[PDB]
Design a protein that fits this description.
Assembly: monomeric
Distance between the termini: 4 Å
Order of helices and strands: EE
PDB class: antiviral protein
Number of helices: 0
Structural class: mainly beta
Entry title: Three-dimensional structure of the cyclotide Cter M
Number of domains: 1
Helix content: under 10%
Name: Cyclotide Cter M
Strand order of the largest sheet: 1-2
Keywords: Insecticidal peptide, antiviral protein
Length: about 30
């Protein structure tokens, strides 16, 4: 739930370790 990944999975993929795609932004828990 925390978008502290600093990544946007516009395509639907987050390269940031353990970061879940919370389209369009990646969030960890």
């Amino acid at each position: 739930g925390l978008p502290t990944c600093g990544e946007t999975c516009t395509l639907g993929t987050c390269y940031v370790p353990d970061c879940s795609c919370s389209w369009p932004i990646c969030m960890k828990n």
